[PDB]
Ligand binder design. Structure first.
Ligand code: PEE
Ligand code: SF4
Ligand code: SF4
Ligand code: SF4
Ligand code: SF4
Ligand code: FES
Ligand code: MG
Ligand code: ZN
Lengths: 176, 208, 376, 230, 125, 97, 48, 96, 115, 112
């Protein structure tokens, strides 16, 4: 099924011809456009007062990366390197060895944030909910080097944003 | 079967097999093989000399009426004596059908240009030349389309390195952008993903 | 250049302001996507299609997912297909808004752009709520969708849909009957049906010349054979008819969105085959097979049986197709991407014969070109 | 000659007398799934992963231990063989620990790969799993016996190749355990090969522990210079 | 009508490869050895072409691994040894070819585990 | 909205429509930002029996394409790739715009 | 908070004039919001 | 459990500190060195060993599906405690 | 017979004639390239560089390869004449920012591991 | 009679029956120079004879369009012109001859 868009004929009676002549000589559709713009003039604008007001986001929102801890303070990361394997941009670099107590932990965990595409594949692949994409998006820098995160930076991000991250995960973990 | 398995369509399968038999009968001089895939896609393999007659027949014949060239591309298989597989994808609006025509060439054998059959083939042939190095004879204006000016090599060949050979930066002494051999601060990490166990017995090859 | 979309170097030969020749130079945004895909698993290669046409993201996701599913011989669950069609129509709305408003900007009607990008922002809110990303969502995957819709999303989509019509009406009040807009668009870039077919055109570039063709009708995919809508057809093959066709396609997309909202079924969201789609996180943390399949699907990915397919959909810009070759492993051997913008811009010089500079600007605007898919 | 004629999915194969079903299948380029079978160790026949159906035979046979008879048609991809493989993999995975992220075998595990290829995709085991204590057998081979699948490859290698009879099984039933039953070190010049032969991460290299994953390593084929063997 | 050229195939001048990476490279043609950690043999079916390993060094920032040869990740797959040799010759690369290694057929007998007088008798199962 | 009724009337006259009926600002009709948790139902394959994977394996049911008239190896009516496409019907909803 | 404003203007923060070490009478930015009020302010939750 | 090197550089949890003669120290001049102060090994060392009355215990890290994959730990040896390979918690049977 | 399809030339003589025509075109174009691109080199330097690029492929004996090289040279000349190339592209033929890499064994031994 | 075809560039053809008869007679006369056992000749002659018989047996243009399954007889005329051009080109090409050459041993083997 289909329809035509430009297949209507104008009536040739004197009434319609006079109306079209008045439209041509008196610019009625131009006045209609002016009226629409004037109508929009008196409407309330859609602008928000950033940074005092913020755009709405979701618990699913993907922001700055962070490394999480268990409630005892133990690192959740077990150096399984699933996030490194799945990372479509090869932004994750991981090295590991047995810790002084024999635990499986990382010694290097870097995310090149200028290689990252913020796809969230890494937090999907993580089996222990160790690497997540946080709610923060305001972390612009002045130098390129500051966007090359090592394990200390990601652990500090986790320690700093865990209060929001745990609540965001609590609201969405039943969809995952 | 049912919920998770893709359903079959035998009617389209028989129709495409019959039309492939039809085309093979009409053009025995060029057609070498006709295949129908299990998801109902018809493929016709031709000799390189038959590029123009076969496409013209498929476009102009009353029973074919493939008036639209959907896509034209190349595939690089280094293990073959004829390296480059040239793929034509056609669409018929009269019969609501699609067809694929495939031929082959190597690095030094030209392929006839199809701009006389399909005007769309101009930029597709330009891209094939740019990416694979396949020359098209009688092309009205053949030149690079996608690569930088003065770019050497054909990137889409399997033996071309992923990061290429040269990289760009701005040099202050000469006050211009220069090209230098590639150095990567981090090397791309090659992953060996293939499982040592066979996945699909239906495609097992003879052990030679 | 404001009318060159950032990365188009159009070399034009001019006699006065009359355009003698158009020689589009492309590759200023060629990033070698097709070669990069060869070094990725299918899941790892999915996000490239988000950035192919960055105005219609989920449509490219759907096309790639359909190609991969056809090669895998699997079937998505019905609820996933309904969500796919709903979000594809939302994406068509976004794309047609962008096309029409940027076109009017190039001619000079700069006001409807601001009116319509608020609706675009609301639709980005829909994407972010469903996937966590505003535009490059990566929601549609082979086997279904990544996550189920959060509670309350359908009500907000209904609230947006019941009001989008008045925004369309205001746009059409500002442009359709204006004599300046008609003088700038009527009889500009006229293309014949035979030339459009022979030049490889698709979508509105075909329907504006009277050709009755739409892939959602002739070759339906997902549940497009379960929804009712009309196909706008032009008759003069010019810019004005294509504008009218795009506006009516927005209205028909609203109609399809209504039908999808009322027909959403229950059930799972991805194929119940853990060798292709990853299991739920509780199952992964509970059972041995689920953990093994999660590990293998996120390290190696699923192997695809050997074969080659060409899968095409009715994207908002025309026919978007993928020629995907599988060699039997978990990484694709070859992935050729077909973009309507490629052929449409290849036919730009033909359509610009006998026209002026502003006419060529209008023709660039009416061809609806995004160079991510042109250059790839 | 003395060769007999057998069929693998209807394809004629000429094999020597005493050839097993598995070897006849591999002559036509198919690898039968296996856990306990190693071509350089004695035949055990315990894992039961290699069960395959012979045409006109009601009961499936163990392809690793059964000599093939003349005229037999081995049906390696029939419904019976596939369901037998699925059942065996189910029984193997019933008690296996969810240790893949922390297991060094992950990514190069025969259990994982053969579960992906020949097993089902989900579980219906609703009980608790068994856990066993670890054994200290030296500073070279790391031992996590909960991942053991009781293949007995390590015992056969120690007995036959290394000439050391220190490994065995104690108990019976679900409580059967692989070890030494005493605190003893399996210290031999060939002791490190039990890591390779072990299909699972029950035995792993201790110096190599946690450092890398199989897919990221680049393979360089070379020659050993620690002796004159080459 | 054909021209009947009579010289061996050479396409080095058309590939856009720098002179250093044509005359100083050594490619190895081989069938990869089975990963001894597993028993699967599906990865030992085809022939591979790989280049000689070049220098890798630590990046002063982040301590990442850096490279300067563009061919460090290039691996080609061939169905036969002759195809790989022909590709290497027409590309002008000096090559080393290693013959395919196939495990020899072995005599397995379950009854040998329980011999009356031979040493093959097992002490445990 | 918080616009005075005189400004509202001026807006309606200028636009020619009832603007307050359809507002772009969406004050309170939207859903709450906090929602109850979702149950999330399982797929058809979540069964304890009669669920062997070999009966629902779509990947293993794919097979190589059928070969038609390889070259290596009457009445005979002509055929088309498919039956001719049926002519489209004009819309009953709105045939002409 | 003012629920009579449209979505986006119903929640806002008045920033302090002195955070950890700097004077923020004029120099304010969106990164000064602590995580809990960050979650409330961006409407990720309906509960302060 | 942060510790300073004889040069004054804070030693991280991974134990890496630049050698006094290492030029790479210059990157921290006029700036700082990012170090996380919550050492996980010390934090997990503070957790008490749980007394349980069974030979096999189950651990999922707490929180149900918000923890780690559920594993079962044998506790037959009285010489050493049963440690979780994911979380690091310790379990033991009643003795003494 | 080797049964090969030609591109342009039947043998090496017509290939040589096409090479000579391309060389003539480049030789004519060089001064215009120097003027239009505002290059700091002289016409002699440009013509010497053209000669160097032509002599780079002097060893080719296959007429098809020579034909393809001539096609590529004509593409490069068409790019240069139409000012599709920029000054950076033209100066990329000179490698003015790359250090001279030594060729003798001792220097390579000193600098690194590359042969 | 009909005001427009609805397709840009496709003019309305007055007296379509005579044009179709002329085009089909031309197609048959061109096919007559092709060898009798050529599949193209016999197939095209069969379909052309069917269409010519339909044209000669129905004077109503709309019902002839319904019978021909060709979509607005002007497009039928265009298709007949295309068929005539193809017939001449095919007569030049002689594609009924035996296959020119066989492909390399493993030219079409996939995978690899
Ligand atoms: C009893 C004896 C009386 C004597 C005679 C008096 C009677 C006169 C009756 C007729 C008067 C008509 C005057 C209008 C003059 C021009 C009208 C016109 O036709 O121009 C338009 C074009 O004019 C425009 O459309 C304007 C374009 C620019 C628009 C800019 C904004 C529009 C103006 C906004 C409001 C105007 C307010 C002006 C007054 C401000 C106060 C000083 C024609 O163009 P087309 O439709 O394309 O037709 C050409 C081929 N047939
Ligand atoms: S979000 Fe995606 S690109 Fe970024 S680190 Fe995670 S997996 Fe890699
Ligand atoms: S962050 Fe998660 S996925 Fe990545 S290595 Fe650590 S535990 Fe594995
Ligand atoms: S042995 Fe294999 S299946 Fe078991 S935990 Fe380790 S990797 Fe996973
Ligand atoms: S330790 Fe390994 S080889 Fe030994 S019985 Fe257990 S799984 Fe088999
Ligand atoms: S391989 Fe035959 S029973 Fe184990
Ligand atoms: Mg092992
Ligand atoms: Zn735990």
């Amino acid at each position: 099924t289909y329809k035509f868009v430009n297949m209507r004929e104008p009536s040739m009676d004197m009434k319609s011809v006079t109306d079209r002549a008045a439209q041509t000589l008196l610019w009625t559709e131009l006045v209609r456009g002016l009226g629409m713009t004037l109508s929009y003039l008196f409407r309330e604008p859609a602008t928000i007062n950033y940074p005092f007001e913020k755009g709405p986001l979701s618990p699913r929102f993907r922001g700055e990366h962070a490394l999480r801890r268990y409630p005892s303070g133990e690192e959740r990361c077990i150096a399984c390197k699933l996030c490194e394997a799945v990372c479509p941009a090869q932004a994750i670099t991981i090295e590991a060895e047995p810790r002084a107590d024999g635990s499986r932990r990382t010694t290097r965990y870097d995310i090149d944030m200028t290689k990252c595409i913020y796809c969230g594949f890494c937090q999907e692949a993580c089996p222990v909910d160790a690497i997540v994409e946080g709610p923060n998006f305001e972390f612009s820098t002045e130098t390129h080097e500051e966007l090359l995160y090592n394990k200390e930076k990601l652990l500090n991000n986790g320690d700093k944003w865990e209060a929001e991250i745990a609540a965001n995960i609590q609201a969405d973990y039943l969809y995952r | 079967t049912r919920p998770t398995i893709r359903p079959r369509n035998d009617v389209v399968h028989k129709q495409l097999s019959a039309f492939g038999q039809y085309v093979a009968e009409i053009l025995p001089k060029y057609v070498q093989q006709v295949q129908v895939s299990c998801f109902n896609e018809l493929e016709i393999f031709i000799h390189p000399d038959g590029v123009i007659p076969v496409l013209t027949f498929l476009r102009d014949h009353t029973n074919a009426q493939f008036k639209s060239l959907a896509d034209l591309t190349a595939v690089d298989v280094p293990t073959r004596q004829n390296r480059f597989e040239i793929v034509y994808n056609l669409l018929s609006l009269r019969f609501n059908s699609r067809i694929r025509v495939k031929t082959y060439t190597d690095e030094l054998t030209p392929i006839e240009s199809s701009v006389t059959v399909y005007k769309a083939a101009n930029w597709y042939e330009r891209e094939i030349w740019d990416m694979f190095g396949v020359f098209f004879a009688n092309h009205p204006d053949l030149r690079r389309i996608l690569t930088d000016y003065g770019f050497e090599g054909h990137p889409f060949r399997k033996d071309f390195p992923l990061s290429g050979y040269v990289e760009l930066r701005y040099d202050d002494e000469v006050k211009r952008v220069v090209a230098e051999p590639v150095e990567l601060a981090q090397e791309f990490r090659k992953f060996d993903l293939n499982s040592p166990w066979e996945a699909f017995p239906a495609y097992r090859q003879p052990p030679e | 250049h404001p009318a060159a979309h950032g990365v188009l170097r159009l070399v034009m030969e001019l006699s006065g302001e009359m355009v003698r020749k158009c020689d589009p130079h492309i590759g200023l945004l060629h990033r070698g996507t097709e070669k990069l895909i060869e070094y990725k698993t299918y899941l790892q290669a999915l996000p490239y299609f988000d950035r192919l046409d960055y105005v219609s993201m989920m449509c490219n996701e759907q096309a790639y997912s359909l190609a991969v599913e056809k090669l895998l011989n699997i079937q998505p669950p019905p609820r996933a297909q309904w969500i796919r069609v709903l979000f594809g129509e939302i994406t068509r709305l976004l794309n047609h808004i962008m096309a029409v408003t940027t076109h009017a900007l190039d001619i000079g009607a700069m006001t409807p752009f601001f009116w319509m990008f608020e609706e675009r922002e609301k639709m980005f809110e829909f994407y972010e709520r469903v996937s966590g990303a505003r535009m490059h969502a990566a929601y549609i995957r082979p086997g279904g969708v990544h996550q189920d819709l959060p509670l309350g999303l359908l009500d907000d989509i209904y609230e947006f849909s019941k009001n989008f019509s008045f925004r369309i009406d205001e746009l059409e009040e500002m442009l359709t009957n204006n004599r300046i807009w008609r003088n700038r668009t009527v009889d500009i870039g006229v293309v014949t049906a035979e030339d459009a077919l022979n030049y490889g055109f698709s979508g509105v570039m075909l329907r504006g010349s009277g050709i009755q063709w739409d892939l959602r009708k002739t070759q339906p995919y997902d549940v497009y054979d379960q929804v009712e809508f009309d196909v706008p057809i032009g008759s003069r093959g010019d810019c004005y008819d294509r504008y009218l066709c795009r506006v009516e396609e927005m209205r028909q997309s609203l109609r399809i969105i209504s039908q999808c909202l009322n027909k959403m079924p229950p059930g799972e969201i991805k194929v119940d085959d853990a060798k292709v789609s990853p299991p739920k996180r509780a199952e992964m943390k509970t059972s041995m097979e689920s953990l093994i399949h999660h590990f293998k699907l996120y390290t190696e990915g699923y192997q695809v049986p050997p074969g080659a397919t060409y899968t095409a959909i009715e994207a908002p810009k025309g026919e978007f197709g993928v020629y995907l070759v599988s060699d039997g492993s978990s990484r694709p051997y070859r992935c050729k991407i077909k973009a309507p913008g490629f052929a449409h811009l290849a036919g730009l010089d033909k359509m610009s014969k006998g026209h002026m500079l502003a006419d060529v600007v209008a023709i660039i605007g009416t061809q609806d070109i995004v160079f991510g898919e042109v250059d790839r | 000659s003395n060769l007999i004629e057998v069929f693998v999915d209807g394809q004629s194969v000429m094999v020597e007398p005493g050839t097993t079903v598995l070897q006849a299948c591999e002559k036509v380029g198919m690898q039968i799934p296996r856990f306990c079978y190693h071509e350089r160790l004695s035949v055990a026949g315990n894992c039961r992963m290699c069960l395959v159906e012979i045409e006109k035979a009601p009961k499936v046979v163990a392809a690793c231990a059964m000599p093939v008879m003349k005229g037999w048609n081995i049906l390696t991809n029939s419904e019976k063989s596939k369901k037998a493989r699925e059942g065996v993999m189910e029984f193997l995975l019933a008690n296996h620990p969810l240790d893949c992220p922390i297991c060094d075998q992950g990514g190069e595990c025969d259990l994982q790969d053969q579960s992906m290829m020949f097993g089902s995709d989900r579980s219906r085991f609703l009980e608790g799993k068994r856990a066993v204590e670890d054994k200290n057998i030296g500073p070279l081979v790391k031992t996590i016996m909960t991942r053991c699948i009781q293949c007995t490859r390590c015992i056969r290698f120690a007995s036959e190749i290394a000439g050391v009879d220190d490994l065995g099984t104690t108990g019976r039933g679900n409580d059967m355990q692989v070890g030494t039953y005493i605190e003893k070190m399996f210290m031999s010049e060939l002791s490190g090969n039990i890591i390779d032969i072990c299909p699972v991460g029950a035995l792993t290299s201790k110096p190599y522990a946690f450092t890398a994953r199989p897919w990221e390593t680049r393979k360089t084929e070379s020659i050993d210079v620690m002796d004159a063997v080459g | 009508q054909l021209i009947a050229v009579d010289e061996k195939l050479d396409i080095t001048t058309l590939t856009g490869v720098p002179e250093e990476h044509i005359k100083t490279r050594k490619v190895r043609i081989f069938v990869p050895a089975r990963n001894n950690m597993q028993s699967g043999v599906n990865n030992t079916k085809k022939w591979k072409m790989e280049f000689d390993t070049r220098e890798r060094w630590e990046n002063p920032l982040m301590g990442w691994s850096s490279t300067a040869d563009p061919l460090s990740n290039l691996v080609l797959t061939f169905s036969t040894k002759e195809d790989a040799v022909a590709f290497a010759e027409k590309n002008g690369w000096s090559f080393d070819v290693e013959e395919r290694k196939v495990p020899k057929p072995k005599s397995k007998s379950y009854g040998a585990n329980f011999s009356w007088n031979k040493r093959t008798r097992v002490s445990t199962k | 909205a918080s616009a005075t009724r005189v400004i509202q009337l001026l807006r309606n006259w200028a636009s020619g429509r009832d603007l307050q009926a359809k507002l772009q600002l969406r004050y309170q009709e939207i859903s709450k930002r906090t929602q109850p948790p979702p149950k999330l139902p399982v797929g058809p394959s979540h069964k304890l029996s009669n669920n062997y994977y070999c009966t629902r394996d779509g990947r293993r049911e794919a097979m190589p394409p059928s070969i038609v008239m390889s070259s290596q190896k009457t009445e005979k009516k002509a055929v088309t790739p498919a039956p001719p496409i049926k002519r489209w019907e004009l819309s009953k909803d709105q045939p002409y715009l | 908070e003012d629920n009579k404003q449209f979505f986006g203007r119903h929640r806002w923060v008045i920033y302090t004039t002195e955070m950890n070490g700097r004077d923020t009478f004029w120099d304010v930015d969106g990164s000064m919001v602590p995580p809990e009020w960050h979650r409330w302010l961006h409407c990720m939750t309906d509960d302060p | 459990g942060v510790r300073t090197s004889p040069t004054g550089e804070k030693v991280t949890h991974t134990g890496q500190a630049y050698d006094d003669g290492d030029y790479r120290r210059v990157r921290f001049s006029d700036r700082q060195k990012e170090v996380n102060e919550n050492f996980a090994i010390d934090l997990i060392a503070e957790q008490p060993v749980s007394e349980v009355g069974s030979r096999v215990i189950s651990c999922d890290g707490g929180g149900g599906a918000l923890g780690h994959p559920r594993v079962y730990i044998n506790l037959d040896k009285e010489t050493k405690t049963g440690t979780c390979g994911y979380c690091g918690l310790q379990f033991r049977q009643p003795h003494h | 017979g080797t049964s090969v399809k030609p591109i342009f030339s039947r043998d090496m003589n017509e290939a040589k004639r096409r090479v000579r025509e391309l060389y003539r075109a480049w030789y004519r174009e060089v001064p215009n390239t120097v003027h239009l691109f505002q290059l700091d080199i002289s016409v002699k330097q440009g013509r010497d560089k053209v000669r160097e690029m032509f002599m780079k492929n002097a060893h080719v004996t296959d007429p098809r390869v020579v034909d393809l090289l001539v096609i590529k040279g004509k593409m490069e000349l068409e790019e240069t004449i139409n000012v599709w190339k920029q000054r950076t592209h033209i100066m990329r033929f000179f490698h003015e920012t790359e250090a001279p890499r030594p060729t003798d064994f001792l220097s390579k031994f000193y600098v690194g591991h590359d042969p | 009679l009909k005001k427009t075809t609805g397709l840009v560039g496709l003019a309305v053809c007055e007296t379509p029956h005579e044009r179709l008869k002329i085009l089909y007679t031309k197609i048959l006369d061109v096919l007559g120079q092709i060898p009798k056992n050529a599949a193209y000749r016999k197939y095209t002659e069969q379909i052309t004879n069917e269409k010519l018989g339909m044209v000669k047996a129905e004077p109503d243009v709309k019902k002839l369009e319904e019978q021909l399954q060709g979509g607005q007889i002007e497009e039928v005329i265009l298709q007949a012109e295309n068929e005539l051009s193809l017939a001449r080109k095919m007569l030049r090409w002689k594609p009924w001859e035996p296959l020119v050459e066989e492909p390399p041993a493993n030219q079409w083997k996939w995978p690899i």
